[PDB]
Design a protein around this ligand. Structure first.
Ligand SMILES: Nc1nc(-c2ccc(O)cc2)cs1
Length: 117
């Protein structure tokens, strides 16, 4: 497994998302997020007012992991989970919140260089 992988994630509007989180514990949501990333079944919801209360906790965020540079168009990112106000991981700015993708029509694709850790 290389340390990072280039992915193009479908960006979903929150009201379209059918499965509003990955599971019921921090460890489960991180595990499931990683599996859906592997399978090409992970979407991204950009955070704006009203978005997080419409999604299910624990949340999985992708956050920016370096400023140096975004290789080949793909922002370098890592996963950080949140439950009841506590975060598991420390990283940079949030690009969005990951959710299962089950065929919803995206509004854009977001290119990222994902750290697998
Ligand atoms: N070849 C590819 N590997 C992945 C991947 C692999 C491992 C993870 O933990 C998360 C994503 C996505 S695409």
């Amino acid at each position: 497994e290389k340390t990072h992988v280039q992915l193009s994630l479908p960006v979903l509007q929150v009201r379209d998302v059918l499965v509003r989180g990955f599971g019921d514990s921090v460890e489960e949501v991180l595990s499931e997020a990683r599996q859906h990333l592997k399978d090409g079944t992970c979407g991204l919801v950009e955070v704006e007012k009203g978005v997080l209360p419409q999604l299910e906790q624990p949340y999985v965020f992708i956050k920016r992991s370096d400023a140096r540079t975004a290789p080949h168009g793909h922002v370098m990112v890592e996963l950080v989970a949140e439950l009841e106000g506590i975060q598991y991981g420390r990283s940079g700015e949030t690009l969005g919140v990951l959710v299962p993708h089950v065929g919803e029509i995206p509004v854009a694709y977001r290119k990222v260089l994902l750290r697998k850790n």
